[PDB]
């Protein structure tokens, strides 16, 4: 249930277990989550556990960065979708960049709530 500014980061940058991770996954997944209503330029979805996203937000798997963002200890399976492209209109076509690397987030009561989304722009 998409109730909380928490469930709603999920729906935006959470897929436990992709499919796949290719261009047609982007495609797929960003219309999904009603991310295509203009295509969305970039997002990036996070792989694996709930558990180990959520830690990012204390010193489980967590450290401070930048001014009062969170930046993971752990490194997580990710897969960014790119607007193939310029329209802000669909179809949205995308190509996806699969990756391993270290997660930023904004959170609110120990809870993630935005992704910093500009650090997936270069692979
Ligand atoms: O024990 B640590 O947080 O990996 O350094």
């Given at each position: 249930?998409?109730?909380?500014?928490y469930?709603?980061?999920?729906?935006?940058?959470?897929?436990?277990?992709?499919?796949?991770?290719?261009?047609?996954?982007?495609?797929?997944?960003?219309?999904?989550?009603?991310?295509?209503?203009?295509?969305?330029?970039?997002?990036?979805?996070?792989?694996?556990?709930?558990?180990?996203?959520?830690?990012?937000?204390?010193?489980?798997?967590?450290?401070?960065?930048?001014?009062?963002?969170?930046?993971?200890?752990?490194?997580?399976?990710?897969?960014?979708?790119?607007?193939?492209?310029?329209?802000?209109?669909?179809?949205?076509?995308?190509?996806?960049?699969?990756?391993?690397?270290?997660?930023?987030?904004?959170?609110?009561?120990?809870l993630?709530?935005?992704?910093?989304?500009?650090?997936?722009?270069?692979?």
């Amino acid at each position: 249930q998409d109730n909380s500014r928490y469930t709603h980061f999920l729906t935006q940058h959470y897929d436990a277990k992709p499919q796949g991770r290719d261009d047609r996954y982007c495609e797929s997944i960003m219309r999904r989550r009603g991310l295509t209503s203009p295509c969305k330029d970039i997002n990036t979805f996070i792989h694996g556990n709930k558990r180990s996203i959520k830690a990012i937000c204390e010193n489980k798997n967590g450290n401070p960065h930048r001014e009062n963002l969170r930046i993971s200890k752990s490194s997580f399976q990710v897969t960014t979708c790119k607007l193939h492209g310029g329209s802000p209109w669909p179809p949205c076509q995308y190509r996806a960049t699969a990756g391993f690397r270290n997660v930023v987030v904004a959170c609110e009561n120990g809870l993630p709530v935005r992704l910093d989304q500009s650090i997936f722009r270069r692979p």
